[PDB]
Amino acid sequence: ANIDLHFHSRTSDGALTPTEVIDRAAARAPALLALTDHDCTGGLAEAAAAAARRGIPFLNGVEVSVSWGRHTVHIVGLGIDPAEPALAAGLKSIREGRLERARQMGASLEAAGIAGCFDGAMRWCDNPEMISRTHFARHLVDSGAVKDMRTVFRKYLTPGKPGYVSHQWASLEDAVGWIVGAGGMAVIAHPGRYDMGRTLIERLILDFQAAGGQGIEVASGSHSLDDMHKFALHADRHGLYASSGSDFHAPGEDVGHTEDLPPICRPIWRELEARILRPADAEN
Ligand SMILES: Nc1ncnc2c1ncn2[C@@H]1O[C@H](COP(=O)(O)O)[C@@H](O)[C@H]1O
Ligand SMILES: [Mn+2]
Ligand SMILES: [Mn+2]
Ligand SMILES: [Mn+2]
C-alpha cells in the first residue's frame, strides 16, 4: 500500500527533518502521509508544506505517550487540529518531565559504568525538551558502547536495566480526549509490541473505546504478518478502523509504504477524508 500514517522527524526522535522525511517518502509515490511525532506537533506545518509541494495528500498527526496501569502505550492521533488549546496544553504537560528524566537516565548509566550518556544523547537531539531513549540508544551505538539498537534495549534503557527511569505519561482518557477534541481520530499504535495477551489487549481496547478511541494499527513496521492477522481480528470484533504506518525513524534503523491491510479491515483513511489537507488549495 502507498499509504503511511506513522513516522517521525527530528521534531522528536526521527533522524530526518520534516521536509527530509516527506521527501524520502515521496520517492515511493505515496497517496497519503501523516507525520506523527512523539508528544509534539512542531513538525506538522513544515511537513504539510513539503507534502503539498510534492502533490501528496497529508494528515496532521501525533503520537501520544500514555501510562496505562504498569504499561506504557502509544496513542496516535490523526486529522488533529494542532492549534486546538486543550491538545496543545496536554502535549506540553507530557513533555514537561522529559529533560529531568533524561538527566537521571544519564546518571543511572554513569553509575553502571558508562559515563557521558546524557551529553552524548543530546548530540543526537535537536530539541532538548524532546530528549528520548531513542537518542540515548543512537549515542550508545555511535560511541561503540553497544553494537546495535536491538542490543541496546536488551541491556539498557528498559525496566530493571541501567538507564531506565520509570515515568508517568498521559492517562488513556486524556490522550484520546485531547485527540478527539482536536477533531481527530485516536489510534492504538503498534499493539504487537505491548506485553499483553488477548485478555489485556481486549481490556485496553474496551478502555480505549470508552474514552472515545476509534482505531488501531494493523499494518505496522513493528508487526509481523501474524501480528497483522491477529490485530485485524481484534479490530473487527470491536468495530475499530485499521491504520497503517511504517513507524520510520532513520535509514538503517521504509517510509511512504506499508503492507496491504487484510481484506476484513475497514481502512481508517476512508474515515479521515474530510481532514485530509489536499495539495490543491481549491479542494480544501
Ligand atoms: N526495543 C527497541 N528498539 C528500538 N527502539 C526502541 C525500543 N524501545 C523503545 N525504542 C525507542 O525509544 C522510544 C521511547 O523513548 P521515550 O519516550 O523517552 O521512553 C520509542 O518511541 C522508540 O523510538
Ligand atoms: Mn520513537
Ligand atoms: Mn510508539
Ligand atoms: Mn512511533
Side-chain angles (χ1 to χ4, degrees):
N2 57 357
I3 307 283
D4 189 354
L5 311 181
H6 191 146
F7 52 90
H8 296 266
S9 74
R10 295 185 78 82
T11 298
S12 60
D13 72 350
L16 276 43
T17 66
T19 292
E20 290 171 342
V21 72
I22 295 299
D23 284 349
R24 180 182 181 92
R28 316 284 272 114
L32 181 66
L33 299 173
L35 174 60
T36 57
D37 276 304
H38 294 286
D39 303 325
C40 189
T41 54
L44 298 183
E46 179 182 339
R53 176 176 189 262
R54 303 274 183 204
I56 305 166
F58 182 81
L59 284 157
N60 292 143
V62 68
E63 183 173 23
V64 186
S65 306
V66 165
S67 300
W68 180 73
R70 83 166 215 259
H71 305 270
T72 301
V73 298
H74 288 168
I75 304 300
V76 158
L78 297 171
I80 51 160
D81 173 5
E84 199 284 315
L87 173 62
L91 296 184
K92 190 173 185 179
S93 79
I94 308 311
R95 298 194 296 274
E96 277 182 33
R98 210 164 243 297
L99 258 168
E100 169 185 48
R101 171 181 177 257
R103 301 185 194 97
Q104 293 167 354
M105 292 188 280
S108 180
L109 287 156
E110 179 185 28
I114 314 172
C117 294
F118 177 77
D119 289 350
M122 192 60 66
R123 270 57 198 252
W124 292 89
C125 174
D126 284 357
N127 311 285
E129 306 273 8
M130 292 313 318
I131 183 71
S132 157
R133 289 187 285 156
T134 301
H135 304 118
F136 276 78
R138 289 189 185 126
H139 170 62
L140 290 160
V141 174
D142 174 85
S143 68
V146 188
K147 67 159 178 60
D148 49 44
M149 296 284 283
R150 187 170 299 247
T151 306
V152 166
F153 290 91
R154 198 165 53 84
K155 305 312 192 190
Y156 303 108
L157 303 177
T158 51
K161 309 282 179 195
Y164 189 79
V165 175
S166 303
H167 191 72
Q168 180 164 104
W169 310 103
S171 75
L172 184 61
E173 290 164 317
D174 278 346
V176 174
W178 291 334
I179 289 161
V180 170
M185 290 178 76
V187 179
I188 292 169
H190 55 61
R193 295 234 313 249
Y194 304 141
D195 175 36
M196 297 181 184
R198 54 179 157 96
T199 295
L200 268 186
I201 288 293
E202 166 120 337
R203 189 62 216 144
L204 174 59
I205 291 174
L206 293 185
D207 284 8
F208 173 72
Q209 287 187 296
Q214 305 159 308
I216 182 168
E217 287 182 349
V218 172
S220 161
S222 302
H223 278 176
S224 65
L225 290 180
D226 286 344
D227 288 329
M228 300 191 51
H229 174 86
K230 183 171 64 179
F231 296 103
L233 293 182
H234 277 293
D236 186 67
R237 301 176 68 268
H238 300 282
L240 295 173
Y241 295 97
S243 193
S244 312
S246 62
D247 196 19
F248 177 90
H249 285 70
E253 288 182 13
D254 183 53
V255 66
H257 180 259
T258 53
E259 294 301 314
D260 291 344
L261 289 174
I264 198 60
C265 299
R266 300 196 291 171
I268 202 166
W269 48 90
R270 299 182 187 165
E271 310 310 324
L272 292 157
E273 291 185 2
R275 302 282 186 254
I276 296 175
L277 313 183
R278 301 291 178 178
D281 280 329
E283 298 179 13
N284 291 306

